[PDB]
Design a protein around this ligand. Structure first.
Ligand SMILES: *[C@@H]1O[C@H](CO)[C@@H](O[C@@H]2O[C@H](CO)[C@@H](O)[C@H](O)[C@H]2NC(C)=O)[C@H](O)[C@H]1NC(C)=O
Ligand SMILES: *[C@@H]1O[C@H](CO)[C@@H](O)[C@H](O)[C@H]1NC(C)=O
Lengths: 44, 49
């Protein structure tokens, strides 16, 4: 619930927030949930 | 040499650079732990990062 709430609130700020790693073998993200979900209220 | 003729022996196993960070220890966890190592030595004073 906390991850879905933070992602839903982050989607309003920017569309292509979900980005993942290309390959484990062989553009660093700047807008993640590390600095965004400071407050959260799931199910009261 | 200076410890005489005790039954223990000393074997060495060394690996080199990997640019990716997970594949540094990905080789280590099945090479050295499978080799029953006692100590691992990291000796890289140049890094690209
Ligand atoms: C040190 O112990 C191992 C025992 O096999 C040998 O070295 C490695 O052996 C593994 C298989 O367990 C191989 O995958 C590696 O390629 C081997 N490395 C080397 C450098 O051969 C080896 O017999 C022993 N002594 C030496 C020479 O490292
Ligand atoms: C969290 O903080 C923001 C800051 O603007 C505030 O508007 C909001 O009411 C707070 N509550 C949640 C959990 O969204």
């Amino acid at each position: 619930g906390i991850l879905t709430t933070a992602a839903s609130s982050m989607l309003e700020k920017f569309s292509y927030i979900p980005e993942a790693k290309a390959s484990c073998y062989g553009e660093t993200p700047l807008h993640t949930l590390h600095q965004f979900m400071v407050n959260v209220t799931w199910d009261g | 040499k200076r410890h005489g003729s005790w039954k223990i022996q000393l074997n060495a196993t060394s690996v080199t650079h990997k640019p990716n960070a997970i594949q540094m220890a990905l080789s280590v966890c099945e090479d050295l732990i499978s080799s029953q190592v006692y100590a691992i030595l990291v000796s890289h004073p140049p890094t690209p990062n």
